[PDB]
């Protein structure tokens, strides 16, 4: 009953059955330099970054190749743009890169301690600076003769007023890397998903860690290192994600919502190639769809990141797989995949045949599901009001199970929306439940038929 057709998979075929030698267990990270500025706008670049075979890619010195004014993202520029703006903090324990230990260094462990708290930007800038000066002093002695760290994470540069010049700068990027782009699936959500279709800022000190994960719904990520320190990246191909999740299960940590730092020897032991690379100031990281990754600051630095949704079959297939898998696991999918697919088909011409067949299949199933739901409600005497979508109306979600609710909305009262199960199970016969329809069969049917492959 999936929104996906297994026959249509464009996932690269990889055999783990054969033993793999060590050199391939440490693959080189695709690094790319940009002599011209139009290279960055070349299609071959986009073809490269989004190739399924290429889990992750570094674009070297792009912030100078287009003359991006990163300086603005400097901590100093930030503190005065707004210092009493606020910031999530992670309190962590500082460690060497490829390692994470119990309290004593007897053992390497998967669970990564990462406690939470809040400050302002100006406040964390104090800390980041003091921290640096301190490390300086302990070196201006030797000359003449557990570390607890705090990481400023997921800082929201969403307010396009306040952060005007900073955001304006990123317009200079090739379209597929931009925050907002007609060719960006995430631009077709119709509302703001903080950190995905808005920019997040990271203020790091050395040892500052972002633990193992895949992006929300397997969406591409674009990260720029502002400077002046470096970052170290580790990454695995989507293919191997369930094997990694299995480790999380054994070590008693939740794969999708838990804090975990992988044990590299485990992954080598399991025949899983790990990409290892350094990201220098002005280097852009492109994380392809579904790539497991984790990240350590080696110096003092800020990064900027957001999620992009290029219109490829791979990206799409993986967004849907994660969408369904999320709900199997009772985990909120923050990109409302069904509402997005309809928005896309109705607003964007698609020339790529494989991507076209995938969206078309999904819309079909969405229609059958709406059709089935309607009959049985009718069949059981339930009246369904018609509700219009208004302009810039968001997607909906079950107040209870967090699943996306599409087209047919169950409502109670100051009004709440539910999926059917959550409505029934809270009223046997749906008494005191209003039921709304947002798209009549014919609206969806016509939209569907209007949707054809562009040559």
């Amino acid at each position: 009953e999936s929104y996906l057709s297994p026959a249509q998979s464009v996932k690269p075929k990889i055999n783990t059955e054969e033993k793999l030698p060590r050199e391939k267990l440490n693959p080189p990270t695709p690094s790319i330099y940009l002599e011209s500025k139009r290279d960055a706008f070349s299609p071959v670049l986009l073809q490269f970054c989004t190739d399924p075979r290429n889990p992750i890619t570094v674009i070297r010195g792009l912030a100078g190749s287009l003359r991006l004014n990163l300086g603005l993202f400097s901590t100093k520029t930030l503190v005065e743009a707004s210092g009493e703006h606020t910031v999530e903090v992670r309190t962590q324990v500082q460690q060497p890169s490829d390692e994470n230990w119990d309290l004593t260094g007897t053992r390497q462990i998967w669970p990564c301690e990462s406690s939470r708290s809040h400050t302002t930007i100006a406040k964390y800038a104090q800390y980041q600076a003091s921290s640096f000066q301190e490390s300086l002093q302990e070196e201006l002695e030797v000359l003449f003769q557990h570390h607890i760290i705090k990481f400023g994470t997921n800082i929201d540069l969403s307010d396009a007023k306040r952060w005007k010049p900073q955001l304006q700068e990123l317009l200079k990027l090739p379209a597929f890397m931009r925050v907002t782009s007609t060719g960006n699936m995430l631009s077709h959500v119709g509302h703001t998903i903080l950190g995905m279709n808005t920019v997040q800022l990271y203020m790091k000190v050395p040892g500052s860690r972002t633990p193992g994960h895949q992006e929300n719904n397997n969406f591409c990520s674009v990260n720029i290192n502002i400077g002046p320190g470096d970052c170290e990246w580790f990454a695995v191909h989507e293919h191997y994600w369930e094997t990694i999740s299995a480790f999380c299960d054994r070590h008693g940590v939740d794969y999708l919502t838990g804090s975990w730092w992988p044990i590299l020897d485990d992954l080598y032991a399991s025949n899983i190639p790990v990409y290892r690379f350094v990201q220098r100031p002005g280097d852009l990281v492109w994380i392809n769809a579904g790539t497991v990754h984790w990240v350590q600051a080696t110096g003092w630095c800020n990064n900027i990141a957001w999620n992009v949704g290029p219109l490829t079959a791979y990206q799409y297939q993986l967004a849907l797989e994660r969408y369904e898998w999320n709900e199997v696991k009772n985990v909120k999918s923050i990109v409302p995949m069904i509402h997005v697919s309809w928005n896309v088909a109705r607003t964007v011409k698609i020339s790529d045949p494989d991507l076209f067949k995938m969206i078309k299949f999904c819309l079909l199933q969405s229609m059958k599901h709406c059709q089935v739901q309607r009959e049985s409600l009718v069949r059981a005497g339930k009246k369904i009001a018609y509700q219009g979508r208004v302009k810039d109306e968001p997607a909906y979600y079950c107040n209870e199970c967090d699943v996306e609710v599409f087209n047919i909305l169950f409502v109670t009262s100051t009004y709440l929306v539910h999926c059917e199960g959550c409505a029934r199970r809270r009223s046997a016969g749906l008494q005191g439940v209003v039921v709304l329809e947002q798209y009549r069969t014919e609206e969806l049917a016509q939209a569907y038929d209007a949707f054809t492959l562009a040559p």
Binding site: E88, E113, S114, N154, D156, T192, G195, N216, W260
Partner: peptide, 11 residues
């Protein structure tokens, strides 16, 4: 709010 963030362990 749908929003991207870091996993957590304390606080």
């Amino acid at each position: 709010a749908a929003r991207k963030s870091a996993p957590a362990t304390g606080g």
